[PDB]
Amino acid sequence: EIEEKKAQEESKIEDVDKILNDILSISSECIQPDELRVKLLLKRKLICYDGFEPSGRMHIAQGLLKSIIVNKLTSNGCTFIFWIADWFAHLNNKMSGDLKKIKKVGSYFIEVWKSCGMNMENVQFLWASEEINKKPNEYWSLVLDISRSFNINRMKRCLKIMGRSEGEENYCSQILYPCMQCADIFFLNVDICQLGIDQRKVNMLAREYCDIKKIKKKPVILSHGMLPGLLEGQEKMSKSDENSAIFMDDSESDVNRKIKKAYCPPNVIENNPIYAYAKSIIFPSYNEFNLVRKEKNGGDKTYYTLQELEHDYVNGFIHPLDLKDNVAMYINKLLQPVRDHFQNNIEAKNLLNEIKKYKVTK
Amino acid sequence: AQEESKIEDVDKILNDILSISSECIQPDELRVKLLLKRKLICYDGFEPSGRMHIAQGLLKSIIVNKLTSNGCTFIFWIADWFAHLNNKMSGDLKKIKKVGSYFIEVWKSCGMNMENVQFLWASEEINKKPNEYWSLVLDISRSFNINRMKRCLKIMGRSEGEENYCSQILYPCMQCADIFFLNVDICQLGIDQRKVNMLAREYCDIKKIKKKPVILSHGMLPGLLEGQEKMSKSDENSAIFMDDSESDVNRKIKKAYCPPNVIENNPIYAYAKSIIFPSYNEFNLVRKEKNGGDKTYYTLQELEHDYVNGFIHPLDLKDNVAMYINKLLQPVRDHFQNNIEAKNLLNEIKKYKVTK
Numbered sequence: 001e002i003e004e005k006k007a008q009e010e011s012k013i014e015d016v017d018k019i020l021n022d023i024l025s026i027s028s029e030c031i032q033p034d035e036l037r038v039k040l041l042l043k044r045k046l047i048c049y050d051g052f053e054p055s056g057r058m059h060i061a062q063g064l065l066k067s068i069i070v071n072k073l074t075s076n077g078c079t080f081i082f083w084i085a086d087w088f089a090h091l092n093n094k095m096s097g098d099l100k101k102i103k104k105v106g107s108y109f110i111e112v113w114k115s116c117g118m119n120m121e122n123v124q125f126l127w128a129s130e131e132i133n134k135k136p137n138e139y140w141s142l143v144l145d146i147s148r149s150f151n152i153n154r155m156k157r158c159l160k161i162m163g164r165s166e167g168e169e170n171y172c173s174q175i176l177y178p179c180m181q182c183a184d185i186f187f188l189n190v191d192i193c194q195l196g197i198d199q200r201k202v203n204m205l206a207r208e209y210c211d212i213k214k215i216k217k218k219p220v221i222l223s224h225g226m227l228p229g230l231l232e233g234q235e236k237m238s239k240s241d242e243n244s245a246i247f248m249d250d251s252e253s254d255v256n257r258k259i260k261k262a263y264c265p266p267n268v269i270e271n272n273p274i275y276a277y278a279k280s281i282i283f284p285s286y287n288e289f290n291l292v293r294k295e296k297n298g299g300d301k302t303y304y305t306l307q308e309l310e311h312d313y314v315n316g317f318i319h320p321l322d323l324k325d326n327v328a329m330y331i332n333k334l335l336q337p338v339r340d341h342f343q344n345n346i347e348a349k350n351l352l353n354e355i356k357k358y359k360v361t362k
Numbered sequence: 363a364q365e366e367s368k369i370e371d372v373d374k375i376l377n378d379i380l381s382i383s384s385e386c387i388q389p390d391e392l393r394v395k396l397l398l399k400r401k402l403i404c405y406d407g408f409e410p411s412g413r414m415h416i417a418q419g420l421l422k423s424i425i426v427n428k429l430t431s432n433g434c435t436f437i438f439w440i441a442d443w444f445a446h447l448n449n450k451m452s453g454d455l456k457k458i459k460k461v462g463s464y465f466i467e468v469w470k471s472c473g474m475n476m477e478n479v480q481f482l483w484a485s486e487e488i489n490k491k492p493n494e495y496w497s498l499v500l501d502i503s504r505s506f507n508i509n510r511m512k513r514c515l516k517i518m519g520r521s522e523g524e525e526n527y528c529s530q531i532l533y534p535c536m537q538c539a540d541i542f543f544l545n546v547d548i549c550q551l552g553i554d555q556r557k558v559n560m561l562a563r564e565y566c567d568i569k570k571i572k573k574k575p576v577i578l579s580h581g582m583l584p585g586l587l588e589g590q591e592k593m594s595k596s597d598e599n600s601a602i603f604m605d606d607s608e609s610d611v612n613r614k615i616k617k618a619y620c621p622p623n624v625i626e627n628n629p630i631y632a633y634a635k636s637i638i639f640p641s642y643n644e645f646n647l648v649r650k651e652k653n654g655g656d657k658t659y660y661t662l663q664e665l666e667h668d669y670v671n672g673f674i675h676p677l678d679l680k681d682n683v684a685m686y687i688n689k690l691l692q693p694v695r696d697h698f699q700n701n702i703e704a705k706n707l708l709n710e711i712k713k714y715k716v717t718k
């Protein structure tokens with residue numbers, strides 16, 4: 001009974017190390033893998049979350065890239081919260097600060113995520129407005145206590161989380177908003193903040209708040225990297241950077257048109273967004289990269305690892321046009337279930353029609 | 363023609379109010395208000411951050427009773443969450459609430475036990491309508507930049523000099539929201555609060571709200587010692603407290619600043635002018651014959667002439683101001699000496715360390 005106990009304990013540590021190692025694989029940065037390892041030792045599921053301003057069409061980093069990450073976590077003992085940050089978009093002047101339009105876009109985001117090929121068993125969609133107003137004393141008390149703990153300058157270091165900067169006129173809303181986002185982490189009892197690296201400053205503020213308050217339960221920051229825009233030098237795909245985005249409602253022709261003229265330098269993967277889509281979206285989705293091409297250009301070839309793919313790209317074995325053509329085809333295939341849903345479901349088709357009539361305000 | 367009477371009345375009302383007030387942001391709006399066949403809503407707000415000083419009881423009572431007697435409601439906003447946000451009473455909301463309770467006991471025994479006065483708790487009222495309240499706070503924050511809002515630091519007793527926490531941006535957004543949340547017609551606070559009252563009127567113009575609050579600011583009662591332009595818990599030994607005993611009052615007044623011939627920033631004279639003379643409609647100065655003998659003052663003009671000309675020595679003014687303050691505090695003393703439950707409450711809050 002000492003050797004089966006030993007074999008019971010060994011098998012558990014190997015499981016955790018493998019669970020940790022590929023939870024880390026979706027990530028650009030983890031603020032303490034050792035703390036993540038610790039948290040995966042709990043019997044319970046770990047609460048993870050990301051949050052979204054409903055501010056316009058959804059681009060493929062928020063749908064396609066997101067679902068890969070969420071699927072990895074929910075198949076590894078996590079629960080995942082999508083926080084529909086409607087009050088936040090309103091505070092940040094989005095959708096002309098019209099909350100009815102914001103909530104329409106939020107419903108649209110949920111329709112997208114539900115047809116994204118995410119396993120939904122351990123996924124929840126929570127609306128900021130609804131949840132804050134279920135427990136408004138607890139929530140605003142937290143907001144106020146966070147505001148007392150940090151000075152203004154420190155909080156202005158979080159402007160990037162709302163797409164703002166010191167350069168513009170800074171409204172007091174830009175102090176309230178990061179206090180609220182920080183409060184959300186505690187309000188939602190999050191174990192893992194799982195947002196893009198542009199949100200990291202307010203996730204670090206939350207850890208700092210823990211030290212200030214002598215809270216030992218600190219959230220782990222599991223940041224994912226920025227999916228780049230189509231054009232050279234666009235580090236971040238977004239509605240804000242013109243011509244940078246493929247959207248979740250783009251048609252098969254739109255995707256083909258956008259990929260064709262995207263930046264894809266020969267022999268180079270640094271700052272190459274076509275390669276980035278291959279590496280961050282297609283390869284995790286398919287677990288191989290199957291490069292299809294004409295016999296004239298070398299026929300088809302399957303890449304079973306990312307190193308294989310990189311090697312053949314930098315040495316000119318893969319021409320840019322072959323890389324672009326396959327990336328377009330795989331993005332189109334990954335968007336097929338979303339397209340089907342908005343063609344076959346007339347309520348959802350309606351809703352997409354309504355939200356596309358809106359004006360994208362900043 | 364009976365609106366003739368209506369207009370004569372209101373004009374008299376307005377003249378009295380402006381005299382006691384230090385500044386009124388638009389008499390003409392206040393006149394329009396006073397000519398609404400409804401009850402106007404007035405308010406003042408207090409952080410429960412320590413013992414109450416005489417500006418907040420004895421002086422407060424004079425303007426409150428003038429407004430309520432004309433049909434107004436006067437809300438005393440017990441700003442418990444604001445005190446916690448402003449780091450008072452060690453941020454112990456339980457102590458803040460006990461202080462708030464003791465405030466109500468003081469106010470009820472110094473002239474505010476009345477139908478037209480409401481004692482409302484900030485925490486309680488915000489949590490009845492939290493979506494409405496916080497939506498306002500957020501929309502106010504969107505409307506003003508950080509520099510504009512830091513111009514309100516004085517309303518919390520803070521300055522640009524010290525470390526400015528984000529709580530000092532949130533607090534004025536919340537105090538501004540209160541004005542609309544409480545449907546206030548007249549903000550009747552000290553002049554140290556005027557920056558955020560002006561922000562509320564600016565918010566109305568930004569939002570095209572035509573119902574704008576009148577700001578009716580009262581002047582600051584000076585502290586006991588030289589150059590303390592404002593009595594406060596903040597300056598130690600600046601304050602006479604509503605719970606001070608007769609020996610405490612006598613001790614503090616004897617020690618106080620009272621420059622001969624000088625009325626400017628002379629706190630002893632300020633207490634005579636702003637509290638005693640309005641409360642009694644006269645000032646009876648008791649003195650020995652060799653020092654000028656007893657004299658009854660029926661106007662502030664004569665009191666000022668006699669003081670500036672050296673007819674009233676500072677010791678005589680002090681002895682009489684102390685007598686009168688003790689007289690005015692007698693109903694408070696009797697309440698806390700007899701109402702054993704108020705007695706126990708005073709004994710507890712006296713034991714609280716005042717924090718900033």
Ligand SMILES: Nc1ncnc2c1ncn2[C@@H]1O[C@H](COP(=O)(O)OC(=O)[C@@H](N)Cc2ccc(O)cc2)[C@@H](O)[C@H]1O
Pocket residue numbers: 050051052053054061062065083085088161162163180181182184185194195196197198199224225226227228236237238
């Ligand atoms: N190009 C890209 N590549 C990869 N990830 C991306 C890219 N663009 C955006 N994201 C990620 O999408 C999510 C939404 O983005 P956004 O709506 O801007 O978030 C905000 O405003 C946040 N303050 C919203 C918010 C509010 C409260 C709260 O408690 C949590 C969050 C974030 O995780 C972004 O990092």
Ligand SMILES: Nc1ncnc2c1ncn2[C@@H]1O[C@H](COP(=O)(O)OC(=O)[C@@H](N)Cc2ccc(O)cc2)[C@@H](O)[C@H]1O
Pocket residue numbers: 406407408409410417418439441444517518519536537538540541550551552553554555580581582583584592593594
């Ligand atoms: N020496 C003095 N002479 C004459 N009046 C004085 C003197 N000292 C203080 N007051 C006056 O007493 C009252 C309380 O004072 P405080 O508790 O400091 O107020 C604050 O902090 C206010 N932000 C509290 C507040 C919060 C929310 C809101 O919706 C309204 C108000 C104010 O009206 C002061 O002007």
Ligand SMILES: [Cl-]
Pocket residue numbers: 490491492493494495
């Ligand atoms: Cl409400």
Ligand SMILES: [Mg+2]
Pocket residue numbers: 292293294295299300
């Ligand atoms: Mg082929």
Ligand SMILES: [Mg+2]
Pocket residue numbers: 475476477478479480481
């Ligand atoms: Mg009453």
Ligand SMILES: [Mg+2]
Pocket residue numbers: 648649650651655656
């Ligand atoms: Mg005599």
